[PDB]
């Protein structure tokens, strides 16, 4: 009777930036999703492909838990068929997603009087991200036609921008912690049943 380690993901002390979203693999344990679904503490709890209403009687090959932090107005972007900063350049979900998305306000933890500038997002890229792709490069983006030559200046921007997280910001500009659970189903024993 091994319990699935969801405490290390949901109750973690420090989270990762959206461009460097953290991935954890969960296998060979028993998960009680009714505990999460009946917590009355999550602002957003939306599940695609599967029905959240007591459908824990299914066996899955693996569970990928992806953790990051965004602002409130961007939470709508974490869904299939969405466009925007996060969906295009930071975190993209496939159109045939089968999983669960949980997001809750974290203004009491991730905010910082004076500004929490350690949460970043990528603003410039040459092309859109493929689903479940991660980019951690810091190459200078070429906006015009003059090469940057590795230095920043006119039409030469650092590709990362910083969130400004303060307790006095509006709901649309307050931190939100997001955990995405992806359920893999392949020709495998599928040891993750979780009765």
């Amino acid at each position, epitope marked *: 009777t091994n319990l699935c380690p969801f405490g290390e993901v949901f109750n973690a*002390t*420090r989270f990762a930036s959206v461009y*460097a979203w953290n991935r954890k693999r969960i296998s060979n344990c028993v998960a009680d999703y009714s505990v999460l679904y009946n917590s009355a503490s999550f602002s957003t709890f939306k599940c695609y492909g599967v029905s959240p209403t007591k459908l824990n009687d299914l066996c899955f090959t693996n569970v990928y838990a992806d953790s990051f932090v965004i602002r409130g107005d961007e939470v709508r972007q974490i869904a299939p068929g969405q466009t925007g900063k996060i969906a295009d350049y930071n975190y993209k979900l496939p159109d045939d997603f089968t999983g669960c998305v949980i997001a809750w306000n974290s203004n*009491n*933890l991730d*905010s*910082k*009087v*004076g500004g*929490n*500038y*350690n949460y*970043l997002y990528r603003l410039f890229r040459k092309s859109n991200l493929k689903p479940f792709e991660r980019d951690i490069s*810091t190459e200078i983006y070429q906006a015009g036609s003059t090469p940057c030559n590795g230095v920043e200046g006119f039409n030469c921007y650092f590709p*990362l921008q*910083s969130y400004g997280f303060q307790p006095t910001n509006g709901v649309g500009y307050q931190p939100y912690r997001v955990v995405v659970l992806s359920f893999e189903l392949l020709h495998a024993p599928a040891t993750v049943c979780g009765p």
Partner: antibody
Amino acid sequence: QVQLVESGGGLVQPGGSLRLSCAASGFTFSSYAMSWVRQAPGKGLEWVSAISGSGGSTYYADSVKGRFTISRDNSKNTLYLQMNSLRAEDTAVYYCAKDHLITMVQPEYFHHWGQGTLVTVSS
Amino acid sequence: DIQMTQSPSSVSASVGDSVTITCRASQGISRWLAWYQQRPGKAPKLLIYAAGNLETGVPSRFSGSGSGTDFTLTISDLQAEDFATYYCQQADSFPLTFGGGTKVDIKR
């Protein structure tokens, strides 16, 4: 896991200059924010300065600002602290500190510490 | 502007007893606080970060609690290697500030 070694400490006269160096091995040097923290011979700890994983942002205390300058070289994996207009109150042991997690703009915590170099100021 | 106050300045305890140390902040710093331990002639070592999160190698007899303004560090089963100086540091506003320090001594 990582290893931080500090050097450059010594004996200088009041009003002189010094350059302290911190060499780091075992991690991506450009993804972490570095800090300089000093401890007086018989007093407590005091945070001195901080850099931000690049060089864009530099943070100084209200007692070293105007005299200290922090910089880094990511190609050589080194960190430099230039101290000018030194007085007797600057006699302390200096530590090069860094946090476990990937912090790019702000120091936060200090999980990794170096050996420290004693800097004496006297005539 | 964000000065932090420790209490008490010094305490005495015997092996097997428990010690409590309080750290207060001028303004709310949420849970941006760290507890450090230092022995004479050596570099400081981290014990607690966040507010009560344990470090991977620290013995499980160190506990931390509190939030906002008050914070508390607790040593449950005191041993012979737990006589040192402890500091509380905030990490929410610049410049970063350290606590005064509390020394734990042998009682006789």
